[PDB]
Every structure is written in structure tokens, then in C-alpha cells.
Design an enzyme around this catalytic site. Structure first.
Site, PDB file in Angstrom:
ATOM      1  N   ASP A   7       1.074  -1.445   0.065  1.00  0.00           N
ATOM      2  CA  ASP A   7       0.304  -0.309   0.562  1.00  0.00           C
ATOM      3  C   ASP A   7       0.658   1.463  -0.156  1.00  0.00           C
ATOM      4  OD1 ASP A   7      -1.458   1.900   2.703  1.00  0.00           O
ATOM      5  OD2 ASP A   7      -2.564   1.657   0.311  1.00  0.00           O
ATOM      6  N   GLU A  70      -2.847  -1.662  -5.093  1.00  0.00           N
ATOM      7  CA  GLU A  70      -4.302  -1.498  -5.451  1.00  0.00           C
ATOM      8  C   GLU A  70      -4.113  -0.233  -6.894  1.00  0.00           C
ATOM      9  OE1 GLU A  70      -6.857   1.153  -2.773  1.00  0.00           O
ATOM     10  OE2 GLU A  70      -6.876   2.293  -3.778  1.00  0.00           O
ATOM     11  N   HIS A 143      -2.053   1.580   7.524  1.00  0.00           N
ATOM     12  CA  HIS A 143      -0.881   1.388   5.744  1.00  0.00           C
ATOM     13  C   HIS A 143      -0.888  -0.459   6.394  1.00  0.00           C
ATOM     14  CE1 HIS A 143      -0.006   4.861   8.333  1.00  0.00           C
ATOM     15  NE2 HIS A 143      -0.787   4.824   6.669  1.00  0.00           N
TER      16      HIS A 143
END
Ligand SMILES: [Mg+2]
EC number: 3.1.21.10
Lengths: 166, 166
Positions: A7, A70, A143
Site C-alpha cells: 500500500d 491497489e 497502512h
């Protein structure tokens, strides 16, 4: 199936690794969790250089079959998106050097995979990740939790033959 | 004064190196010029990995004292800011490894440095780059020409003691 999830973002980079059961309901063991941090007192290239070094170390130590990130969408492409891109660029160089393929999933795909539908709350995703990893308390900080959610999302889609290469 | 300039992009990345010489008007020799090309048929990591590889080799071989990049975030962009960010991430990792400081300039600063004012035509910048390099015809291709403009923009400000770290 060993999967690394990442991330990115501006100041933090969540970095997690899970080992998923090959059969049965989605279930995994947490192998590693860290958050790579930046300093406002170091040049931009140092922040990105550290990300590359840390990702490469984790890829080396755990030898995952996949890196999952992502699929980032921006309503507006500008300097903000550009700087998130720097972090992903460092991740991609590491993945290239380590020989690990990279996959990307949209935020709604994560919500669907982990909490059942695309409009599920982030809190419900967090609770399901806790359950899938068999953990007493949900992973902290956010996170790291987000990196783990993306790793498990890849495992989910990969099992049903719908992995999404980046 | 050896300077590497970069015209960032993911599909095309211009990469030039100049050696600025003398105690007079801005004057330089072209040491290296290339355009790195990558395709959407390729995994993201292969595209970014190629950029990192080509840039790092140039930084190692030519020992520039600076890497200068153009930055532009107007509404209209030739490639997504996010993906240009991936490319810059690769550049930053390379600069980190080679120990070369990074500088960034916008189109207005380029026009100010090489054409005298911020509203000058691009064509005037191109003509000045041709002049500084002592060439009969302007350098080609376009991505290389733009990379050279960035390098010489940095050199101008560096001589003034007003260079702009990234
Ligand atoms: Mg170009």
C-alpha cells in the site's frame, strides 16, 4: 500461495506478506508486516530508494509468487498522483529485479473479495482480514492492514482464475 | 559540468547528457542521447524496469553532477501523471543508487532560462538548444531534444547558483 501486498502513498508504504491455504475457504498465515517510513529531511530520491531496498529485501526473504497492489484511480491526475506513482515505480523496479509478477485490484474489488460487496465499509474489510489471518486483534497500523487486504484480495481472485496482471 | 536531462514518460522517455564548457555564454557538447521506449503489451514492471536500467547505466557511465527532469501538471497531459510517476520512480531509484542529485524545472523555467521569458515559443527554446550545442540542425528526435532543453536549463541555473532540487 505466498503473496506480498503493498500500500503505497505519500509518507508511508505498507508492506505485508501472507501464506494462503491452497484449498478450502480463504485462510492465511501472516508472515511479515512492516510500514516503510519516509523522512521530510531526506531528498525525494532517498524516500524512493528506501522503498526499493525494503521491497527487494522482503521479496528475497519470502519469495512470494505474486506482488499485489491497489489499482489506483484518480479523479484528477496531478502532482499528487505523480508522487504516489513514484512509490509504485520503486515497487515495480524491485519486482522486476526479483522476478515476481505484479497484480492490481480496484478498491471496490477488495471490498467485494473480503467483505462480500463493493460498498462494504473499510471497517468491515479490516474485521474480515483479522478473521482470515486468525488474529486476536486486527493488524495495525492502517497502512499494514491495507497491504494485507490487497494481498488476500489477489489470493481470492487468483484461486477463481480471475487474477489481474498489472 | 556534466548534466543528464530527462523528458519523462512511460511510453517514451528522453534521456540526454551534455558537458557544459568554458567561461562564457552557455556552450555544451552532446555526450549521449537516447529515447527509452516501452509498450502497453508489456507488464508494468518490465516497462519501469527498462527505464531504471537505461537511466542507471547512463548515470554510472557519464558521472553527471546532476539529473534534471521536467515537471508539468497542467490539466491536459501527454500521459497519466500517475504513470509518468512510475517512470520518475525508476529515475529516482537510479539516481539514489548512483549518488547523483536530482533537480526539477517546469516549462516556464525552461522558457525563462533558454529563451529569455516565460511566454517564449517552444520553437525559440529549440533554436537556443541547437545554438548552445553548436549544431547546424536541432537535435532529434523530439523527446531527446526536450531532454536536452531540461539539461541545459539546469546548467543555466547551476551557473547562477540558483538550481532547483526536486
Ligand atoms: Mg517526450
Amino acid at each position: 500461495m505466498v503473496v506480498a501486498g503493498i500500500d503505497p502513498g505519500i509518507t508511508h508504504l505498507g508492506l505485508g506478506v501472507v501464506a494462503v491455504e491452497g484449498k478450502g475457504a480463504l485462510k492465511a498465515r501472516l508472515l511479515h508486516g512492516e510500514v516503510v517510513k519516509t523522512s521530510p529531511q531526506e531528498p525525494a530520491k532517498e524516500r524512493v530508494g528506501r522503498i526499493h531496498a525494503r521491497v527487494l529485501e522482503v521479496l528475497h526473504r519470502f519469495r512470494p509468487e505474486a506482488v499485489a497492489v491497489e489499482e489506483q484511480f484518480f479523479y484528477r491526475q496531478n502532482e499528487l498522483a505523480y508522487k504516489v506513482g513514484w512509490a509504485l515505480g520503486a515497487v515495480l523496479v524491485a519486482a522486476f529485479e526479483a522476478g515476481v509478477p505484479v497484480y492490481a485490484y480496484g478498491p471496490m474489488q477488495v471490498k467485494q473479495a473480503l467483505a462480500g460487496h463493493g460498498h462494504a465499509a473499510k471497517e468491515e474489510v479490516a474485521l474480515m482480514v483479522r478473521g482470515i489471518l486468525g488474529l486476536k486483534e486486527a493488524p495495525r497500523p492502517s497502512h499494514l492492514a491495507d497491504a494485507l487486504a490487497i494481498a488476500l484480495t489477489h489470493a481470492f481472485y487468483a484461486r477463481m482464475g480471475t487474477a489481474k496482471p498489472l
